[PDB]
């Protein structure tokens, strides 16, 4: 599977906002040209989701942190765009590189926390998403009694799977667990 061409690069070359990285202010990693509240959510956010697949700067830095800021500031409006995010999200997971999936899981964890209704709307989309997780589930390494460094890269992909799956299980509701079983045989419920 070649690198399917990312729309975010085509939106960024002419119109995208997050270029601003300049501060004389008490602000975070990225800045916006305009306040995100005025922006629409059908055009910007799906493009941002597609940008996590970028591998070289400045595209991926803006796309990753832009997605985080948009999901944090505007959690009410994202419910409408939830169906449109499945396609670009499914593009990112199929890359299977041990770096993109870390970003995707961070976004997903930041996504389910926004609204229990959102996670209930993601139950039909589990089948479209989980097969990547169902592959990488058991990639941990045995070291015995001595030390793990990987977590400062935050790249121990298995541990990200466990917490993230626990997050959909809590917010998924009544029918999230049975769907997880249909995708993940080795999973066992953490409901209580």
């Amino acid at each position: 599977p070649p690198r399917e061409f990312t729309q975010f690069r085509r939106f960024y070359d002419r119109g995208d906002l997050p270029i601003s990285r300049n501060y004389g202010d008490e602000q975070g990693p990225i800045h916006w040209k305009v306040s995100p509240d005025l922006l629409d959510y059908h055009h910007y956010l799906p493009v941002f989701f597609d940008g996590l697949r970028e591998t070289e700067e400045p595209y991926w830095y803006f796309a990753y942190y832009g997605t985080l800021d948009l999901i944090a500031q505007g959690p009410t409006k994202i419910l409408a765009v939830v169906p449109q995010l499945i396609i670009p999200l499914k593009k990112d997971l199929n890359t299977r590189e041990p770096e993109i999936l870390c970003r995707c899981m961070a976004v997903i964890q930041a996504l389910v926390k926004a609204d229990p209704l959102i996670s209930e709307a993601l139950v039909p989309y589990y089948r479209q998403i989980l097969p990547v997780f169902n592959e990488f589930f058991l990639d941990n390494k045995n070291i015995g009694d001595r030390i793990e460094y990987s977590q400062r890269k935050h790249n121990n992909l298995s541990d990200l799977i466990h917490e993230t799956l626990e997050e959909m299980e809590k917010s998924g509701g009544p029918e999230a667990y049975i769907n997880i079983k249909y995708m993940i045989p080795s999973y066992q419920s953490a409901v209580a």
Partner: protein, 430 residues
Amino acid sequence: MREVISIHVGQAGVQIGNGCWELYCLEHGIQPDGQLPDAFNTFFSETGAGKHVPRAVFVDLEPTVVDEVRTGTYRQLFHPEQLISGKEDAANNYARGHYTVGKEIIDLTLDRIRKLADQCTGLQGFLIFHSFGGGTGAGFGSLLLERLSVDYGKKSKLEFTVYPSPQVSTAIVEPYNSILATHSMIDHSDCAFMVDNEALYDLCRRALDIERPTYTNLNRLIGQVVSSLTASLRFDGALNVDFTEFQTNLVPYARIHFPICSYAPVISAEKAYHEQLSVAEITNSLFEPANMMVKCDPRHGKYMACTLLYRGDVVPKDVSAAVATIKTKRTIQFVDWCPTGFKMGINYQPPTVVPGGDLAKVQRAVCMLANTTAIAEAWSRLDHKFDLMYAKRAFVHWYVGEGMEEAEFPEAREDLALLEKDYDEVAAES
């Protein structure tokens, strides 16, 4: 890695840029086509294969100067979007290049530089070049600095300008353009260096064995200082000095942010054969009022800060020995509230020679930056010349019809009076 973006505004700045990038590529081993026969990320960008592109943007309102670069040997290295050429010039009028003509191209320039800054993740400062007497260099540069201040905020904006010579002049309207540019520059510029062509002419004639130099020799001398100044961030050294470290050494006060420069040893390719050119010899030669390229005697004023950079075989001892030796000079005065007042940086990479150049095969060299009250000597010269123009309103009609309100001239005069008055209190001792 860590990046610096350069802009070359005006006829003077573009020619200065050509000499600098010629020196960089020779110093870096990069061919004019961008290929090779490290710290290249600081000044160049890699586009795959084996091609590199400088992080430079050339701005001028006349196409002839830019077209020379577009048709030169180095035309392949630069990117077409980097070179920006205007349609009609500012005609040595600050008003024409700031309000009427500058505003047509100001926003076109900003996008191209801002797009380039996205690629520079480790960017920690811009280099900006001016000519005070020029209309485009002053009129457009002042507006561009104002836009850059709000856009980037707390990013370093280093400037390197050509202050008018005390006696040698090229434009009659020079005093008007210089004062207006400084009034805008005094608030937005993080730090700005000054050089005058008259002292450069004297130094390149006395030290270098050239009977009749041109602007090319002067640009080569300027480029050596810039290359030595930026060599700290590119190559390993026994002491590394950063851009913010060049800033706060020299400018303990906001409005007193003006340093002066001098370089040594500037010796011809045949007279260097007869001397050692050790660290002690070059360290003493810097303080000589003949070597420094701003015609204001420091023996009339005082020293307020000094910074040294060593490139070559230089060593921790004889730096420390020379600094102690220099401190014993009673012809040199320091204020008591500046007891240390020095810095040195030590870099291992020797200075690079230039084919067809005017320098000698030196093994060690030193570049010096200092702040002094002596700059007030030239500021009164500019003020008096401006007063002669403005007493009889000899050139007001050109500027007023081209856009500013007349009330801005006394505003710039008052700002100059406060700035000179600020330097005077700093000169005093309590």
